Structure formats: C-alpha cells, structure tokens
Amino acid sequence: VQLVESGGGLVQPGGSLRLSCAASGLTVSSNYMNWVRQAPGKGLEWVSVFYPGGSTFYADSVRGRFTISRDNSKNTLYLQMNSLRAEDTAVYYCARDHSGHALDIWGQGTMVTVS
Amino acid sequence: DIQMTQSPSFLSASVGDRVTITCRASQGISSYLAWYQQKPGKAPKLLIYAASTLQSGVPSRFSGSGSGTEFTLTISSLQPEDFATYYCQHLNSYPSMYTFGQGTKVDI
Amino acid sequence: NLCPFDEVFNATRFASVYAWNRKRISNCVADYSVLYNFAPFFAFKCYGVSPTKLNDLCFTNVYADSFVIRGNEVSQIAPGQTGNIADYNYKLPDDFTGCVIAWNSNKLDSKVGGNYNYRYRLFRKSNLKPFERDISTEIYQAGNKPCNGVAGVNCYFPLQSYGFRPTYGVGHQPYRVVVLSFETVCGP
C-alpha cells in the first residue's frame, strides 16, 4: 500500500498550512494513523494520532496549534497547523500501525519549512 | 514516564565483521519494541517488530532478540550495502505515546 | 445474608477486559467496610457516592464488574475518557453513580515468564456505548479489499496479549479493577 503526501513549501511564522495523506489500499477510517516529525539531522518525533473512533491524541509540543482531520470521501488524512518558527521545521511522515506499536507503511516525506 | 536511550551512538564496522546494537528503557519495559532502518534522505521502513517477529520483505539476515530492560539487535551477514541509521520505539500512556529515543549511526 | 463481596474480590483468576464479568448483587446486606480491612488499595475512587456514607444508603441493584488492566491504563476507567481500553473494551457512562477499586496484583497475577492469557481489543470499527461488551474474535478488515479468514497482511487478529513478568516496571505491572455500579441492598 502507498501513502503519498502532498502540501508543504514555505510558510511565514504565524502562518498556516495543511497536509493531506493520500492512501490507496488501506482505509483511513479503520486504522491507527499518525504523524511523525523529523528535523534535519536529528531523530524522529511523534505529533498526532487518530483512532478508528472519533479520538485524537497530540504530543505536548504540538497541542493547541495542530489539528488533524479525516475525510472518507477522498480516503485521505489531513493535518492542520498554525505554524511557529521552531515548532515546524521538519519533514512530515504518515504511517499505519499494525500491532499497536509498529509503524510499517511510511509515506514519502514533505518538507515544511518556516521563514 | 520512561526514557529510551541507545549506548552505541556512532560506530565503525567493516564489511567482514558483524554489528550489535542495544537500546535501554528506563523503569522496565514490555515486550513491544520496533526497529527501523533509515537510509539518508529516505522514509524509514519497519525492520523488526514485537519480540523478534521479523517481517515479510525484511531479510533473514536481520534478527533482533531481547527481553525486559536489555534489548538488542544483531546483523549476521557481511552488510553489502552499508546501512546508515537505526531507531527504537515503544508505545506509552496518554501524554507521551510514541518514544523514539536517540538515533544510531553505523558505517564503514 | 451478607452480600458476596468476599467472592468477587478474592477471585483466584479474573478475566480479560474485553470479556468482563458482571454480578448483579441484589437482596443482601452490603457491609462495604470489609474492603479496607482485607485488601490494600491503589486507586479507591467513587463518583456520585461517598465511601464512609456508603453503608447507610439503600440501592436496588449494586453491580460488580471485574477485570485486569495495566497499571498506567487504570486511569482510563472513569467517566468519559478516551483510550484503547475505555473506548474499545469497557466504557463507563458520564452520569456514573458508583465506585472504582484498583489494587496491585504483581505478587500473584504476574506469571513466571509469560501471561499471554490476558488480552484487550486493539481494533474495533467504532466506540462502545456505555456499559457494553464484545467477545467477537473475527478477523478485522483494513482496506477496501475483501478480507479473508487468514490474517496475513491488511487483516489482523484484533485481540493483543499483555506481557506480564515480575521484573517489569510499576507502569506495566498487572492490576485488578472492580467497578461497583449503583442503581433491598441496604448495609448495616
């Protein structure tokens, strides 16, 4: 299964962007889907999560400015951000959880830089 | 709360020999841990999940076995394409959830 | 005729959260004071009722739901809340009148090298209505492709097994939770 991601570019501090996670092969409204962040030359970090039910948990560093959304019409996952200069300077990844701990289907990253 | 740390950090390993990696979890741990491989400039792919389950498409070359606090992964073969980076994780309670910890680097 | 609160609390083997027991305690004297004297507690909490003033009250039905949950996941048993256990295994109602009792069981419930008996429902299509139960072991479907009997890829066995060992940290240690829902049953 493929998870192609769109959106990105450069947004000024205090701006806003949205990223869409296109998945063809798995249902977004049925799997644990989450967002993973990776600053250049550093380790990975976790941003959001979105259960099959209407549930969502955010990390502490991305709470209150980051909103996630799902649309079964296009079978895609959306993330809404209200950016900050150090909150969002990284490639963003979209993944699925098989056994409650492992993320297998990692999509290609999207560069989201702020300046 | 638990903190995931890896001891080796950078390493130097030749083609002939093997490489062993270990990452520690504070305050104990369950049996659920995943290992990732991330070549530079590429999205990481699952390598080993759960307790040495191994994954379809991952070569039998890789095998990571461990229990409790001490967890490790080892590569048996000669590593033709020199691998680059590796990570741990473990899902947690409400506030933290996915914890990846410091990365690891191995090369020629 | 004292209520069988002694039998509920000192069960040798409890059940997993996904298939939780239930006991309709009715037509007996409660005597709630027996809980403190015998079993030390970890999280003794009550909603809509008081601990000391529990004996001098009358109820028509005092239920009792028992299961075993991870230590760090005991907090999901509360009004509302969202999580792996609350949303998909056992959901308490908002206007909840009852008491929740949790006490550690790492001394006894933990096994020598594995306790794969206990399971929880990782995968479900939608949340549970309050006070519900699902014991289906059917293979889950992920993706528009039809799902066959064999799990394989994109189809998963929903239930996932706890790992219990005596060396595990206090967060991942086994716990025993009994919820006494409230609704003849007048203690002395």
Numbering used by the authors:
A (entry chain H): 3 to 117
B (entry chain K): 1 to 108
C (entry chain F): 334 to 516, 523 to 527
From the paper:
Here, we firstly identify a human monoclonal antibody, 8-9D, with broad neutralizing potency against SARS-CoV-2 variants. We then determined the cryo-EM structure of 8-9D Fab in complex with the ectodomain of the spike from Omicron BA.5 in order to understand how 8-9D neutralizes the virus. We next assessed the antibody competition with human angiotensin-converting enzyme 2 (hACE2), which revealed that 8-9D blocked the binding of RBD and hACE2. The structural details of the epitope can be used to interpret the broad-spectrum neutralizing activity of 8-9D.
However, the local resolution at the interface in which 8-9D Fab binding is poor and the map is not sufficient for ab initial model building. We thus performed further local refinement on the RBD as well as the bound 8-9D Fab, and improved the local resolution at the contact interface to 3.32 Å. Each 8-9D Fab binds the RBD with a large buried surface of 1140 Å2, of which ~60% is contributed by the heavy chain, while ~40% is contributed by the light chain. A total of 24 RBD residues have direct contacts with the 8-9D Fab. Between these contact residues, 21 hydrogen bonds are formed and 5 pairs of hydrogen bonds are found with a distance equal to or less than 2.7 Å, including (RBD-T415OG1-HC-S57OG, RBD-Y421OH-HC-G55N, RBD-L455O-HC-Y34OH, RBD-Q493NE2-HC-S101O, RBD-S494O-LC-Y32OH). Some residues form multiple pairs of hydrogen bonds with 8-9D Fab, including N417, S494, N477 and N487. The complex structure shows that five of the six mutated residues form hydrogen bonds with 8-9D. In the Omicron strain BA.5, the mutation K417N leads to the establishment of two more hydrogen bonds through the side chain of the asparagine residue with both residue Y53 and residue Y34 of the 8-9D heavy chain (RBD-N417ND2-HC-Y34OH, distance: 3.2 Å; RBD-N417ND2-HC-Y53OH, distance: 3.7 Å). Apart from the hydrogen bond between the main chain amino group of S477 from the RBD and T29 from the 8-9D heavy chain (RBD-S477N-HC-T29OG1, distance: 3.7 Å), the S477N mutation also leads to the establishment of a new hydrogen bond between N477 and T29 of the 8-9D heavy chain (RBD-S477OD1-HC-T29OG1, distance: 3.3 Å).
